[PDB]
Design a protein around this ligand. Structure first.
Ligand SMILES: Nc1ncnc2c1ncn2[C@@H]1O[C@H](C[C@@H](N)CC[C@H](N)C(=O)O)[C@@H](O)[C@H]1O
Ligand SMILES: Nc1ncnc2c1ncn2[C@@H]1O[C@H](C[C@@H](N)CC[C@H](N)C(=O)O)[C@@H](O)[C@H]1O
Lengths: 344, 9, 344, 9
């Protein structure tokens, strides 16, 4: 029926809103001080973008950003939440005496009906690697409620990618896969599945953090402007790159992170997940190459990162990279929904 | 369910 | 409409079989050497239950248990697997030159056709706390293919329950929940959700191991005989208990583990997950009592553990307990499907 | 979550 049900398998949706129905998982995000405090500073320092304005909070979870919008003097805030967390948000709105200002509206933002158009939309719709969950598309879908010349918080998003070297990591994954090389596991030959195993293990994006010295070139930026993008712009995301290699070594894959900017009338406030910044619950993401590329300082590593949306609220990622000076090419798939959470 | 990673503490 | 489809929400099924479709998840089980090595020994040491026999492998996964049936001399093995792992098991059957003796049948064991009756059914259908996943019911369902006087491997399963004291584990719960007892979390009073948070954390069974010294009375045992049991017998599982307390202290909940036995013609071999035995990928499971009970050595802690199967391939657990000498009472509800993995 | 991770030797 809805734009959401059309693009989403039910099995994905149930599991997804299940996860966000746990107070523990809302608390997980809330306790990211860099996340939650940057959102509050973006909202409070741009008070005039909220004062006496009508606001839509897309996926309000606990209500936390709706509270900041209220703290900033919003006249009315529509807080939309599709999980059962909606019920807990209404309890907090009553207990904080904000029944006059915050109106929880349970359901998917694609399916609910709002009483009026809004001056500004706030959300925190960023998955790991920015695009996981496809919630950016719910955020963009919500502009059907936005007044002309209305604002988005966050306003833009920058994906950064850079090449890295990490033989320890590479070897970690390679070794897991090599279980399936054994010709006599309890007397059974598994070796026929070695190829399928390496494929599966290297499909997995690695979520953790790293020292910036592992980066072999300055990062490439790809920007999504939320005021101007439409939903369909996120169906197929093509990110071409050309890297000027600053260090010689093996390139074991690409590292990804993202920043979002809240472009307000008073000031712009950045929320960064970069490895040069304080760590967030998004960490950073690395896509490993099954076959590493050797490159020399001054070479160019060029190619395309292609993200193709799927029905499981995520993306089919293909990364094709080549060292221009040798025609050494690496083609890679990555199943963004099946990550290896490596952080400790 | 492989959605948001744990906040670092 | 199959027996499986009718008991199982599609959204649980999809996710469930997605999990087992990963080589890394098959690998996880295979690498439990206690599990895999005991299965091998049970089968190989009872070679006369397999020599020239017809075998069904319920949920074959990679194929491993069917390869052991072959090592033991089976004439024909039907290896049923409902996940996409089925394709990979076929690859191994071919590469191990066993197509004449092992036939992979992709699908649910509740939905496939077998061409003939079998002498013995082998399976590994034990979830944590034994009953999680409701795969025991698939294993029982398969008896429709068993010849009269056919055998089951495993043959019986015993769940053990015992009271424990672990003050530090208990207090972990309130620490986590007390996040919500903040009057000013970025200016928001969260306190109204503190009781809901407590209840959510206490609804989680705790998967990890522990020192046996925490145990306060000898265990009570609830046995399922797989030769005799019907599927329906696992929809409502009532485990009465009267513990004669050997140690005085605060009882913080009940600890669970399980054993299975392969009763072969030559010998009975046991696979135990007890906290006195080497650790398995099942660990042990603790259900906390949100109001703990004081008992002295000599007292009787009586009550019932009631596991009620649900359509998410798991159980709603109700635990009710009292110290008979004082009348003090504790009532607890847990969601077996959503544990805390505390070993990690 | 379905099966827990096997104990690391
Ligand atoms: N289409 C949708 N409609 C309504 N809510 C959604 C939708 N997609 C995701 N959500 C919710 O959006 C929230 C995403 C969270 N990252 C944000 C929670 C909260 N706003 C916070 O910043 O703490 C979750 O609570 C989801 O359940
Ligand atoms: N109803 C069902 N029909 C067929 N296969 C099932 C069913 N339920 C669970 N399974 C499979 O049973 C397997 C359970 C595993 N613990 C056993 C795998 C393998 N036999 C081993 O011992 O390593 C998974 O591969 C599931 O996909």
């Amino acid at each position: 029926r809805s734009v959401f049900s059309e693009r989403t398998e039910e099995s994905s949706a149930v599991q997804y809103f299940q996860f966000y129905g746990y107070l523990s998982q809302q608390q997980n995000m809330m306790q990211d001080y860099v996340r939650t405090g940057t959102y509050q500073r973006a909202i409070l320092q741009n008070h005039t973008d909220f004062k006496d304005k009508i606001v839509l909070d897309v996926g309000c979870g606990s209500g936390i950003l709706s509270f900041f919008a209220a703290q900033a003097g919003a006249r009315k805030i529509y807080a939309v939440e599709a999980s059962t967390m909606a019920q807990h948000a209404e309890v907090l709105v009553k207990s904080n005496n904000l029944t006059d200002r915050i109106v929880v509206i349970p359901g998917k933002v694609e399916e609910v009906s709002l009483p009026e158009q809004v001056d500004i939309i706030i959300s925190e719709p960023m998955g790991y690697m920015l695009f996981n969950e496809r919630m950016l598309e719910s955020y963009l879908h919500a502009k059907k409620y936005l007044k002309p010349s209305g604002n988005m918080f966050p306003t833009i998003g920058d994906v950064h990618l850079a090449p890295f070297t990490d033989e320890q990591l590479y070897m970690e994954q390679f070794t897991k896969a090599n279980f399936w090389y054994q010709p006599s596991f309890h007397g059974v030959d598994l070796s026929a599945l070695r190829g399928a195993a390496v494929d599966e293990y290297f499909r997995q994006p690695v979520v953790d953090t790293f020292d910036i010295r592992i980066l072999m070139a300055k990062s490439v930026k790809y920007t999504v402007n939320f005021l101007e993008a439409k939903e369909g712009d996120l169906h197929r995301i093509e990110i071409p790159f050309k890297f000027h290699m600053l260090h010689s070594g093996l390139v074991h894959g690409l590292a990804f992170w993202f920043d979002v900017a809240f472009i307000g009338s008073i000031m712009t406030v950045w929320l960064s997940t970069a490895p040069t910044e304080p760590l967030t619950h998004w960490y950073q993401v690395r896509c490993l190459f099954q076959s590493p590329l050797f490159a020399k300082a001054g070479d160019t590593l060029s190619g395309t990162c292609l993200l193709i949306a799927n029905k499981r609220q995520s993306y089919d990622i293909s990364i094709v990279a080549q060292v221009d000076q040798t025609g050494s090419k690496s083609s890679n798939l990555l199943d963004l929904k099946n990550p290896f959470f490596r952080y400790t | 369910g492989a959605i948001r990673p744990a906040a670092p503490r």
